[PDB]
RNA sequence: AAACUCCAUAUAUAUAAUUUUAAUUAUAUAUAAUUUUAUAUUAUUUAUUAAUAUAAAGAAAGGAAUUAAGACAAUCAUAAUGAUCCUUAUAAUAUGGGUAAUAGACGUGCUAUAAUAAAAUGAUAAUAAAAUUAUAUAAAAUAUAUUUAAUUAUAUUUAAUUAAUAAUAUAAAACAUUUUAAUUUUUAAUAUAUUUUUUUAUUAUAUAUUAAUAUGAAUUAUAAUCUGAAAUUCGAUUAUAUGAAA
RNA sequence: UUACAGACUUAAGCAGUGGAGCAUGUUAUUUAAUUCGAUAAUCCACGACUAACCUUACCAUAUUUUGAAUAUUAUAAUAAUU
């Protein structure tokens, strides 16, 4: 009934937490404005405009709600949630990375000679 | 230090109100650029816990809000 | 020739729950996250209840998920203690008891067969192969769970006297030396069997020139006689046989030694 | 430095053992082995300890004329207490039973004199 | 390696019975993914765990065939592929110079209407 | 009752204080028996 | 380099017509780069895998015959239970109308 | 435990129509050593022996993983289970701030304090390995700083390659030449030479100075650039100027 | 309580480093917060796979209240079944 962000979004299918709907959030507003925040971008720094317009383009940037920015997004642990020694080949933590790959869940991660 | 060609770092304001009536404008941008317009208007520059009323000048156009609300206290030893 | 042969060692394939190679790297993280995914819920749809009084506990292994080009097969071993009607009677083919009904909708069922909503999540065909193993002692994942699921008003308190005891006469203490030498001894017959062969179809000669470069014996059956799929198959696979276990006592850690 | 360093060993050697208990000095070695490193956490020891007295009886209220202190180290508690109590603090009797080697009274004469609580009266 | 090898000889038996004239499988060099893992200690002891990936890679040449059969070797040894293989297949078309009927971005649209808007367009005003 | 390996449990009550360290201590702490580990 | 500059000016300009390529000859920053970067929102939000996924509450109406239970679920009301016989349940949470 | 096993190394076979070229390679399989033999010497439990040296054969010289117990440590911000406490708040979201404060102290690094050592220059381009590039790697060219050009930085443009193919990327030190404060051990003006990129002679070439230079590059001023919606607290780079300690 | 041997360690030898500036971690102190990381007397509380926002766990202000889950019971909108 009262959605935490202002616009509903479905849930990720594995592991949840505060955190990772947070970024899970921005993940998919990120791509419904892409391409508007791709092009005030382009007005904005496109010398042959003129200042005027170009200005108004950096003010709707400024304007835009925080979930719509790229540099937001940051890369979790999609098991448990940490943020932090994230291995983007398997989209875990280190901790997680060598549980799963002496389990054999990785699929062609073997032990170093 | 942004760069010139990109132009002043524009944030919505509500300088129209300040112009015509006198009103402090109280603002937590502190990334704003203090443009040649608002020289002589009357600011309350959020520092994170309160907001700390400024007057710019002349010589503070080009620099950002934030440069004159300091955020941190002195620091003192208990010596 | 262990190494070399399909019936004498372990693919390194069979060492990954994820058999997949896709040269899209983000293609290739989706499937593996998918199948962590449903191998949750399938360990989720093991438990059945027919009334309360009623529940069927299946063990289900750890999925194998072999992706090929075309396909998507998940293979499981699974095990299912049969309680509800144990008897020596055919009452059981007049009726679908709740582990074939489960059974049949991974893929028998025409309109909400399990494997036709996974091929949309993976976007690919999808198979679904449940192997029954008839013994807890077979697969080191299936006897986990069943210790740590259902024995464990045996260990609650102690492991009971009777329980250990069981857990040690599941097997007859095979001489490991003897069996491991009767295996070296067959695989010696059949290496001399092929040589043999081939020395006499060499000696009784089965262009000189042609007899300097060619490499070609003669005749598949002369090579290969009395090789056949009745005396070599069986006698050269491996892993044949249970000679150690090791079972701790909450996380229950069970050690198979299959030669 | 390294000879009385394993003499202040020694003694720390001893005092590991689980609840073990601290002892008088034995040697002169052992007085200047215990000043420097066993007086720093018995002055502290005692200067919290004094501290929490002036405070919970009442600072106006906390002024011994007539003060005891025994242990095993320089008056370690008379030490504390000149400074806890300021340096215009004069009371009439201070004595201080040192329980160890006689040496220790020489070291407590020295560390004592650089109090200006206790300085012959003209 | 072990079924990268055992398809990679499948296909030849597969495209001499479609008689295409095929090369290999020439290996390629294998391609050897690393990550450490530092441990719980981290103290200068046994506190890294090494892992490693191999991708083993080979290659398989078709020559002097018609497009039909190219595909139709394709579809069967796709129709039966292994677990744990993957294929990628360049084909090469030779083709005459000058050809019968031959062989806009999201961003740039949306850019036209912005500039349209009146946020924009009272500021184009001259 | 503390020492054994049943009274790693028990809480004693003890008061905690922090006191710089003179010019002496530091030098009297400096070599292999002061300031090396023994374990 | 002896080449002049007019006549490899007119070379690069017809040239960039034939291949759809953006002559600027000043030098002007156009933004032409943003136009031209790829979209990576797809790829973006992907990252926590396929949102629709079958769920165990889909299986009630999927496979009405059978009957699953979840032991997840059940374990944490049977919890829920015993707290509440301890006395230690959870507090009635305030209504907004109030 | 060891053996075994794998890796490395040597060799053999197979594969590559030798332009995906590195065939001096790639990677599958197999073989090899835990080396072997003669001889003399010294010891021995003296024999069918060890330590030695000598001769002969050999590519042969290095690593990896590995049992179960016992006693003990860590919150694991690296996973749990219970109990316990919060439930308009100890849960959730947004804006800004903080985690970057600064007396003293400690650990670990970086750059230095000059001549067995620093700085320039080296285009038919001295000589690597291991990795990376579809949530990209970015060539050549042109423009500006900026000078003939090169070099370095950024901009413009976006070739090829999603790869034994194209790109990141002409490795660097080395080596050769030139230069180098302290150093009157220099430089310059004349003359001189069979040392000539140099010698010798006579004149000037500052004093200061236990010391900081043409060593060092901290600090700081100003201008510009890069990423990003945003660089104020609080990022990176460049130019001119500044040039601390040591 | 005796004796033996072997340890780990020891010092020896060699080659680097020990003060200065800065980088970074900790401590202490400060602070609205400077998130968290140590107490049975030798020494010793260390997260460099990237803290501008995010990360974030802390502070100030404002704001949300069955919230991300499962189930129950109602209400509707929708499609099938009957
Ligand atoms: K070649
Ligand atoms: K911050
Ligand atoms: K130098
Ligand atoms: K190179
Ligand atoms: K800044
Ligand atoms: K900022
Ligand atoms: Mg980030
Ligand atoms: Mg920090
Ligand atoms: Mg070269
Ligand atoms: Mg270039
Ligand atoms: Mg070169
Ligand atoms: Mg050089
Ligand atoms: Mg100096
Ligand atoms: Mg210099
Ligand atoms: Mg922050
Ligand atoms: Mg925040």
Known sequence: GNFRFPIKTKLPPGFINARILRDNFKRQQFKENEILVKSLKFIARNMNLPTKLRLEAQLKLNALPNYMRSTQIKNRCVDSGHARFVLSDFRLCRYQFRENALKGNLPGVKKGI | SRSVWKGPNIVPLPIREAMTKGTPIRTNARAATILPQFVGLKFQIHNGKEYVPIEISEDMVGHKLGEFAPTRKRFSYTQ | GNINNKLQHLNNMNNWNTQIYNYNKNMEIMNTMNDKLINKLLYKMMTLKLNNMNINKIIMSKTINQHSLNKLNIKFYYYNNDINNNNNNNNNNYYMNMMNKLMNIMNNNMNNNLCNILSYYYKKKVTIEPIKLSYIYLNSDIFSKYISLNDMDKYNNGILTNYQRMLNNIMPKLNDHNISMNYINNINNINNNKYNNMINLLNNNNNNYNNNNNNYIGNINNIYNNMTIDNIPMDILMYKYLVGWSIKFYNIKVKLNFI | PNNLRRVATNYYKEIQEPNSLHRPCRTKMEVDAHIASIFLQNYGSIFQSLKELQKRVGPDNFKPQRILDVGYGPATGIVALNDILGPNYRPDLKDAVILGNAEMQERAKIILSRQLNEVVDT | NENLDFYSDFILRTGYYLGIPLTGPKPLPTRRERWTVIKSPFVHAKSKENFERHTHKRLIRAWDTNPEVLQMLIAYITKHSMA??????????????????????????????????????????? | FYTHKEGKDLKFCNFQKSIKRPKFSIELKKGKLLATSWD | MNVPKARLLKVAELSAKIFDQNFNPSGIRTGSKILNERLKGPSVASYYGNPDILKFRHLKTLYPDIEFVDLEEQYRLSMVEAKKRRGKGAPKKMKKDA
Do not use: W
Not at chain 5, 87 to 105: A, H, P, V
């Open chain 5, 84 to 126: 744990g293989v993957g294929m990628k297949c360049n084909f090469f078309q030779r083709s005459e110079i000058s050809l019968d009927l031959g062989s806009t971005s999201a961003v740039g649209q949306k850019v036209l209407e912005l500039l349209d808007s009146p946020d924009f367009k009272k500021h184009l005003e001259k």
